[PDB]
Design a protein around this ligand. Structure first.
Ligand SMILES: CCCCCCCCCCO[C@@H]1O[C@H](CO)[C@@H](O[C@H]2O[C@H](CO)[C@@H](O)[C@H](O)[C@H]2O)[C@H](O)[C@H]1O
Ligand SMILES: CCCCCCCCCCCC[N+](C)(C)[O-]
Ligand SMILES: CCCCCCCCCCCC[N+](C)(C)[O-]
Ligand SMILES: CCCCCCCCCCCC[N+](C)(C)[O-]
Lengths: 87, 104, 104, 89
């Protein structure tokens, strides 16, 4: 349920501008935790406040395929989201 | 006016209490934001009322309103069993609040 | 032992109550600081004592100690009034609160 | 009462460092609000609040060579009247 529709609004070889649907009203969580890393094999993470539905991922290596995930504060919302994207 | 603030303060005592349970682990944005604002407003208005009113009187009426409005919200917005004990307990509560105001 | 930390949780409810009276509307540093920490300690120990004890009985003894304790320290520290009527209406008020929270 | 001894610790053409005596621990307040503006100038005075656990504050973005009047306030004047100074950057 929350969150959903993780996309890549814009992307350079070293940066991805992701977004998602925070739901509405009763589903808006306090914060999201965005993680990124190579789809192969340490992950890096950051957190955005729950009111904002976009996030920017920087410092990526061009040409490498990245898996981006957006987690809700708890599992009591509706499973995480995960997408793959090559810079 | 100091009593008017206490009434409003006790009103916000129950709203952040019910918004705390409508929030999960302090995770739902809209409920969590109603708990913090409600708390800050409740404690602020209480500090103002205590500037001119006795602390033992201001605390009791403050908790009393929050406890009273909690039952009024449970009976109405939650389908709560209305007990003859709860009625007389509520009566004792409003009796004490109105009584303290009259002895100001 | 879960009861004793509920008593202490109610004692600190009196702590931040008297400190809130000394803060003069969250203006004087240290009384305004004893107040903030006093209610976080109270809320924490309460959530710990309520994790074992009945949520209804735990709250009735939680605010009961705090309410009565606020009335006692007020009439002592701040020389708050001690009228025959006021203590009667406080008893009616405090028992009304202790009643509604117990029957929940 | 409070605050007490408002002085300029450090100064720069564009910035002033100010400090004051907050008083005793039962005299401390939860915030001071500080006011600074060109003395006599037709410009209204700027203002910001400082945590009451601080006896200092830095005022930035000042016109060099212009005389300013700085004032430190307690939350309420029930404690002590506000203290002011005049410093030329
Ligand atoms: C948890 C305990 C510690 C938390 C304390 C937090 C205090 C809030 C910071 C700012 O405080 C407010 O700032 C206003 C700034 O404007 C002040 O109004 C002042 O400013 C008006 C004009 O700006 C003046 O006319 C008034 O005399 C004067 O009340 C006023 O003092 C105060 O409400
Ligand atoms: C207004 C006249 C009646 C006043 C008393 C109403 C309640 C009496 C019955 C309470 C019974 C509950 N309990 C647990 C004590 O048995
Ligand atoms: C505890 C006392 C400290 C709280 C300070 C409140 C005022 C804070 C104002 N400001 C702008 C510095 O955040
Ligand atoms: C640091 C111990 C925890 C409690 C805080 C109490 C003291 C905080 C304020 C210190 C005094 C502020 N002052 C006067 C130096 O500006």
């Amino acid at each position: 349920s929350v969150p959903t529709k993780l996309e890549v609004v814009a992307a350079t070889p070293t940066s991805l501008l992701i977004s998602w649907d925070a739901g509405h009203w009763w589903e808006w969580v306090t914060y999201y935790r965005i993680t990124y890393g190579e789809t192969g094999g340490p992950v890096q993470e950051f957190t955005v406040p729950g009111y904002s539905s976009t996030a920017t991922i920087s410092g990526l290596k061009p040409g490498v395929d990245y898996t981006i995930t957006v987690y809700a504060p708890t599992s009591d919302y509706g499973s995480p989201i995960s997408i793959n994207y090559r810079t | 006016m100091a009593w008017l603030i206490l009434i409003i303060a006790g009103i916000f005592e129950v709203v952040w209490a019910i918004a705390l349970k409508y929030s999960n682990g302090f995770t739902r944005l809209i409920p969590s934001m109603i708990t913090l604002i409600g708390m800050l407003i409740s404690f602020y208005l209480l500090s103002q009322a205590t500037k001119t009113l006795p602390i033992g009187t201001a605390y009791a009426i403050w908790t009393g309103i929050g406890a009273l409005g909690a039952v009024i919200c449970g009976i109405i917005f939650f389908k709560e069993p209305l007990t003859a004990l709860r009625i007389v307990f509520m009566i004792l509560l409003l009796t004490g609040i109105i009584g303290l105001k009259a002895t100001s």
